[PDB]
Design a protein around this nucleic acid. Structure first.
Lengths: 103, 143, 60, 73, 158, 137, 186
RNA sequence: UCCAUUGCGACAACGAGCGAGACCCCGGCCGCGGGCGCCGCGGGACGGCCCGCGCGAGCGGGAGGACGGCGGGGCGAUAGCAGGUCUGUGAUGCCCUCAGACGCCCUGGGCCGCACGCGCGCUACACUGGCGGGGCCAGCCGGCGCCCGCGAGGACGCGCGGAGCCCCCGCCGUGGCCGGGACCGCGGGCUGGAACGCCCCCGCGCACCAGGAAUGUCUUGUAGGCGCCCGCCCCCACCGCG
C-alpha cells in the first residue's frame, strides 16, 4: 500500500551513476518519481611515500576515491510494495551500483 | 592617580622584607621585586587590604603599609583561596602556607637534603649537574 | 655646466652583460636639437626626459 | 641612562610645564616628553588638565596619538 | 561560518515571504570566497548590510569605499531605491568590495533604460573598472616539495 | 532598535543601568579570577562583570528564537595562549562566570528556557529595545 | 567636477603639480581614491605602476620588514597622522610637500660597471621616484627604532626636511653621497 | 623562427613511428535541467579583429572581452647506475640456526643515556610593541544542552554546530622594564593493569641589544605575516600533507 519508502543509489563512477538514474526516472514516469538530491561528493583521500625505503627526494602519491550518491525518496508510499519489486526489476543490471530501499 | 604634584609624605625609596622598592613605579608591579610575590598574588593581596592598585608606590602610607603586611603573613585568615598559595601544601606541617624572601632559600635547599639521604634518583641528577625532568641532553644546552 | 634636461628619441637596445644598461639616442628639446648618444640604467622608454650633468659626452 | 620623575615635586607643574607649551601651538605627549625632560604619563595628565581649562583643544584624537592645538594662543 | 553558495543565502529565505515578493531586482557581487546578495525595491531611499545601517559598518576607515558607488554619482536615483544586502564569506575587506560591487550592479539594473544605463556604465567604469566586472584571481594550492605555493624548503648542498 | 546603534555605547550605558537597578549582583569569586586560561593577568577594571553581562544579553537578543549554550558563549570570548616557546594555540574562556550570569538573568524572567539552552524572553526583548530607544537620541 | 576626490575629506587635490618636468607624467597626483587603499593589481604590466597614485605607493612601503608585512590600515592611519603634523607645522597642503620631498630626493647619476671600472651613467625617472620613496621610508624607520618618539613623527620630520632640501635629512645625505661618488667615477 | 628534433624553406635521400603536443583533474564567465545538501550536462578563447613588419612560419603595439597569448597539477621516451631496499609480503637462490632455539611466549631494562662538532625547524631580542575590556568576519570541513570546578577536568541527557590577524577604548613609557619564558619547588587532574607520558595553578625569572667568515629561497592573490583541520596516536605535534 503506502510505506514512505526511500531509494538510495551509491557508486563511484560518474558515468553509470548518471545513466542509471535516467532509466530509473523513465521507469517512474507515471508513478510520480521525481528529481534526485545529489549529495556533495565524499572525496576520500590518502597520501603515501612513493619509495618503499625512503631514499631520494621526498615524493608523495595522491590517490583519492569519490563516492557519488543520489536519492529517490520520491516514491514514498506513492507506490505499493507490489510494484516496488517491479521498480527493482525493470531497472538495468549494472555490475557495481549499490542500492538500498528503506521507508 | 589624579596626581601631578608629589605627596608631602612622598617616600622616595620603600623597604620591606629586606628588599627596597623605588617609589616611582606603579604599586602592583613594583612589589614584584620581592621574591615569592608575583602579580597574581599582588593585585589580590592589596584589594583585600583596601588599597588602590594603580597609584604610585611612593604615595602609600604606613597604615596602608602595615595592613598589607598582615594579610601577607596569615593570608588564609582573609579569604584568599587555598589553591592560590605558592606552597599549596607542606611536608611536615601538613597545612598550606605562603613563604617569602626571608625563608625561601630553605625551601629548595632543605628539599634537596631530603632527596640525598633517601638516595632517590631525582637527587643524584641534582648533584652531577644534570637535568631533572625527562630532558634530552645529547645535544641540548651544551655548556 | 648646468645639467640640462634632455628629451629621448630612439633607443638602440641593451648594450651590456647582465643587462641593466641600455643605449639611447637623446636630443635636446631645449630648442637645440643635438642628437647625441647616452647610456641609461633601469626602465626607460620613448618620450622620457633625462637630466644630463655632462652637456657633452659620448659613448658607443 | 636617563631617569625621569613621574611627578613634579612642586612649582615645576605650573611655572613652566603648564607654560612651556603655552608658548607653543602644536604638541604631543612625546614631543613634550623629549622637550620637558620627564615621563609620558605626566604629559598625558597635564594635557587633560589643560583641555579641561579650555585653552588646549584637539584635532585628531585616537588611542595611539592625540594632536593638540593652542586655541587660546 | 556560512559557505556563500548555500541555497538559503542565495534565495534569501531568511526574509519573511510576504516581504520577499516586494523585492524585484536581484544582484550579485563577489571578490574572493565572499558572496554578497542584494534585493532592491524602490522607496524613500535607504541601505542595509547584514541587518545594519550602511554607515555603521566596521572597517570604519573603508566607509568611503563601501559608499563610492553613491558619491561617484548623484544621490538622485539612490533616493528612490532601498536595499537589503546580505553578505557571507571570507574576510572583512573581501566582504566590503563584494558589497560595493553588488550596490553598483543593482543600481545599474534598476534604471530600466538601456541608453542611460550605458551612460552610467561609462561613468562608473572610468573610475575603478572593478566596480562592475569581478576580480578573477584566487588563492592557489601548495606542492609537497616546499611549505608554500612557490617557496621551497631550504636546501643544504653540503 | 539596538541594531542601529554601535555596541560600544550600548554596552556601557546598559551596564551602568544594570548596576543602578540592582539586577545583577557580583558574587564573591569576582575578586580573584583571571577569566579564561588563555589570559595571564586579572581584569584591571572594577566592574567587568556588568559589561560582560550586557554583552551577553545583547548576544541573546541578536540570536532571536535560536538558543545559545553556556559553552557557545564561551567560544566567543576565546583568546590566544602565549609564552610557551611553541606555536600559539587558541583556547576557550571560562564558563562558570557565564553560568552565574545566565542564572542571574533567568531568575529575573528575562531569559526563557528552551529545549537546549535558552533564548530571550519577550519581556527581555522589550527591555533591551526600550533602553536602545532611550539611548538612541 | 561632479565629484572632488578630497583625500581623507580634508585636503583638496585640485591644485597640485610638480614644477620639475623630468618626472611630471611619472607622478600620478590626479586620480586618488578618497583613502589610500585599493586592490588594483598595479605592476601587472611593465610600466603600469607609472599611473598608480603616489600616496598608495607611499603606504605600500611602510610595511617593509617582516614584522609588519601585510598591515596596510595601520599605514593609512600613520599617513593620516603624518599629514596632520605636516599641515600643522608648515601650514600648506601636505601633498605638495610630499611631491617636493620625492622630487628633491632621487639621484640624477649613478655608478655601474658598464658592460670593476665603474662608470657614471644617467638614471631613469621611475627609478628616481622609487628610490626617493624607499629612502624616505627607510630613513623614518631607522630613527624610530628603539627610540621614544613614534613612527609618524619621524615620517613627518623626514618629509619636511627633504622638501626643505636640507642635507640634515637621511635621504638627501644618501643622494648627495651617491651623486658625488658617481662623479668620482666619471 | 619556437621555452621546446615546435615550425618555414633546402638537400642521396624517400616514407613512417615513439617522446613534445593533444590528453585527464581543478578554478574563473554563461546556459539548460534538477534540487534535503548546489550538482549533472553543454557553450565560451582560437594569435580570432586592427595596425606594423617578415615569402614564410611567426614577432611588436591597441582594442573588445570573466579570462590573451605554456593558469596550477597528473602522465611520463631510448639507454643506463654494481644508486636504495633480502628488516614490507605465501618474492625469492645460496649460506647460518634449528630441542640449553636466532622458533613462539612471559617479567624487567634499553633504543631518550652526554665534556663536544652540525642539518632541517620553533621562540624572541619590543612602541610598526606588551596587558585588560569589547566588536567582529573564513575554507579543507565540522556535535551539542544542563550542573559542579578558578582552571585542566568530572556526573548526567540528547541530536545540534565554526578563528587568529584585525578595528575601538584605556594602562605601560625606553629602564634585560609590564620584552623573553628556558630551568627549577609544593599541588590539582587524564590515559593506561602499570607514568618515566600529557594538561592547569602559585612561586623563581637563564642566555638574548638584530648575530663574522659563508650561504639558501622567491615575480600576483606570489613572498611574508596569522591562524585551522587530517596522518601515525592509550596520552602528546615545534613534524608532514592540506
Amino acid at each position: 500500500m503506502h510505506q514512505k519508502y526511500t531509494i538510495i543509489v551509491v557508486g563511484k563512477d560518474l558515468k553509470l551513476v548518471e545513466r542509471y538514474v535516467k532509466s530509473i526516472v523513465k521507469e517512474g514516469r507515471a508513478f510520480g518519481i521525481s528529481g534526485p538530491c545529489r549529495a556533495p561528493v565524499r572525496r576520500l583521500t590518502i597520501t603515501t611515500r612513493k619509495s618503499p625505503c625512503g631514499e631520494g627526494t621526498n615524493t608523495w602519491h595522491r590517490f583519492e576515491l569519490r563516492m557519488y550518491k543520489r536519492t529517490f525518496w520520491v516514491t514514498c508510499g506513492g507506490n505499493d510494495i507490489s510494484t516496488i519489486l517491479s521498480k527493482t526489476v525493470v531497472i538495468p543490471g549494472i555490475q557495481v551500483t549499490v542500492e538500498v530501499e528503506e521507508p | 592617580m589624579t596626581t601631578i604634584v608629589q605627596p608631602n609624605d612622598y617616600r622616595d625609596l620603600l623597604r620591606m622584607f629586606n628588599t627596597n622598592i623605588q617609589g616611582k613605579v606603579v604599586l602592583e608591579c613594583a612589589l614584584v621585586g620581592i621574591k615569592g610575590i608575583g602579580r597574581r598574588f599582588a593585585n589580590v593581596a592589596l584589594k583585600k587590604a583596601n588599597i588602590d592598585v594603580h597609584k604610585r608606590a611612593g604615595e602609600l602610607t604606613a597604615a596602608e603599609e602595615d595592613a598589607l603586611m598582615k594579610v601577607l603573613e596569615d593570608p588564609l585568615s582573609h579569604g584568599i583561596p587555598a589553591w592560590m598559595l605558592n606552597r599549596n601544601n607542606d611536608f611536615e606541617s601538613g597545612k598550606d602556607m605562603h613563604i617569602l624572601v626571608n625563608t625561601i632559600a630553605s625551601t629548595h635547599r632543605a628539599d634537596l637534603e631530603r632527596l640525598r639521604k633517601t638516595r632517590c634518583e631525582r637527587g643524584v641528577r641534582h648533584h652531577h649537574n644534570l637535568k631533572v625532568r625527562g630532558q634530552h641532553t645529547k645535544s641540548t644546552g651544551r655548556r | 655646466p648646468e645639467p640640462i634636461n634632455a628629451r629621448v628619441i630612439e633607443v638602440l637596445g641593451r648594450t651590456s652583460s647582465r643587462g641593466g644598461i641600455t643605449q639611447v639616442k637623446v636630443e635636446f628639446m631645449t630648442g637645440e636639437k643635438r642628437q647625441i648618444i647616452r647610456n641609461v640604467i633601469g626602465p626607460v622608454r620613448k618620450d622620457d626626459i633625462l637630466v644630463l650633468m655632462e652637456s657633452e659626452r659620448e659613448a658607443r | 641612562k636617563v631617569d625621569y620623575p613621574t611627578l613634579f615635586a612642586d612649582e615645576a607643574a605650573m611655572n613652566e610645564a603648564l607654560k612651556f607649551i603655552k608658548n607653543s601651538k602644536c604638541i604631543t605627549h612625546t614631543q613634550i616628553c623629549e622637550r620637558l625632560r620627564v615621563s609620558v604619563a605626566l604629559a598625558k595628565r597635564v594635557m587633560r588638565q589643560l583641555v579641561k581649562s579650555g585653552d588646549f583643544a584637539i584635532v585628531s584624537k585616537s588611542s595611539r596619538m592625540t594632536i593638540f592645538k593652542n586655541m587660546t594662543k | 561560518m556560512a559557505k556563500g553558495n548555500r541555497r538559503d543565502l542565495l534565495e534569501r529565505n531568511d526574509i519573511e515571504v510576504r516581504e520577499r515578493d516586494k523585492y524585484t531586482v536581484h544582484t550579485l557581487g563577489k571578490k574572493k570566497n565572499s558572496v554578497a546578495v542584494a534585493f532592491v525595491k524602490a522607496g524613500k531611499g535607504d541601505i542595509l548590510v547584514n541587518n545594519v545601517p550602511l554607515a555603521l559598518v566596521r572597517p570604519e576607515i573603508l566607509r568611503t569605499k563601501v559608499s563610492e558607488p553613491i558619491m561617484i554619482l548623484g544621490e538622485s536615483l539612490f533616493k528612490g531605491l532601498d536595499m537589503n544586502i546580505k553578505v557571507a564569506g571570507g574576510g572583512h575587506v573581501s566582504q566590503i568590495y563584494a558589497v560595493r560591487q553588488a550596490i553598483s550592479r543593482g543600481v545599474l539594473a534598476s534604471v530600466k533604460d538601456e541608453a542611460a544605463r550605458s551612460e552610467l556604465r561609462a561613468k562608473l567604469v572610468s573610475y575603478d573598472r572593478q566596480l562592475v566586472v569581478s576580480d578573477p584571481r584566487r588563492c592557489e594550492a601548495k606542492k609537497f616539495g616546499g611549505r608554500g605555493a612557490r617557496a621551497r624548503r631550504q636546501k643544504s648542498y653540503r | 532598535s539596538v541594531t542601529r546603534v554601535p555596541a560600544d555605547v550600548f554596552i556601557n550605558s546598559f551596564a551602568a543601568h544594570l548596576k543602578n537597578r540592582g539586577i545583577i549582583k557580583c558574587p564573591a569569586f569576582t575578586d580573584y579570577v583571571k577569566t579564561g586560561v588563555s589570559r595571564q593577568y586579572a581584569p584591571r577594571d572594577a566592574d567587568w562583570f556588568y559589561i560582560k553581562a550586557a554583552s551577553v544579553i545583547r548576544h541573546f537578543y541578536i540570536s532571536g528564537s535560536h538558543s545559545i549554550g553556556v559553552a557557545g558563549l564561551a567560544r566567543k570570548y576565546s583568546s590566544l595562549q602565549k609564552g610557551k616557546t611553541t606555536p600559539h594555540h587558541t583556547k576557550r574562556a571560562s564558563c562558570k562566570v557565564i553560568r552565574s550570569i545566565v542564572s542571574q538573568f533567568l531568575g529575573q524572567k528575562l531569559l526563557i528556557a528552551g529545549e537546549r539552552g535558552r533564548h530571550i524572553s519577550p519581556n527581555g526583548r522589550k527591555m533591551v529595545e526600550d533602553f536602545a530607544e532611550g539611548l538612541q537620541k | 567636477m561632479s565629484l572632488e576626490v578630497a583625500l581623507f575629506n580634508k585636503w583638496p587635490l585640485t591644485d597640485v603639480k610638480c614644477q620639475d618636468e623630468s618626472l611630471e607624467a611619472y607622478i600620478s597626483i590626479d586620480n586618488h581614491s578618497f583613502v589610500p587603499h585599493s586592490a588594483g593589481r598595479w605592476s601587472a604590466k611593465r610600466f603600469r605602476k607609472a599611473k598608480c597614485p603616489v600616496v598608495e605607493r607611499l603606504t605600500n612601503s611602510l610595511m617593509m620588514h617582516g614584522r609588519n608585512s601585510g598591515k596596510k590600515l595601520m599605514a593609512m592611519k600613520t599617513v593620516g597622522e603624518a599629514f596632520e603634523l605636516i599641515n600643522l607645522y608648515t601650514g600648506k597642503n601636505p601633498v605638495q610637500v610630499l611631491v617636493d620631498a620625492v622630487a628633491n630626493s632621487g639621484p640624477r647619476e649613478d655608478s655601474c660597471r658598464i658592460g670593476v671600472r665603474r662608470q657614471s651613467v644617467d638614471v631613469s625617472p621611475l627609478r628616481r621616484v622609487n628610490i626617493g620613496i624607499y629612502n624616505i621610508a627607510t630613513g623614518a624607520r631607522k630613527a624610530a627604532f628603539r627610540k621614544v618618539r613614534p613612527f609618524a613623527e619621524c615620517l613627518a620630520e623626514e618629509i619636511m626636511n627633504a622638501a626643505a632640501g636640507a642635507d640634515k635629512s637621511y635621504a638627501i645625505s644618501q643622494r648627495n653621497s651617491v651623486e658625488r661618488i658617481a662623479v668620482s667615477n666619471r
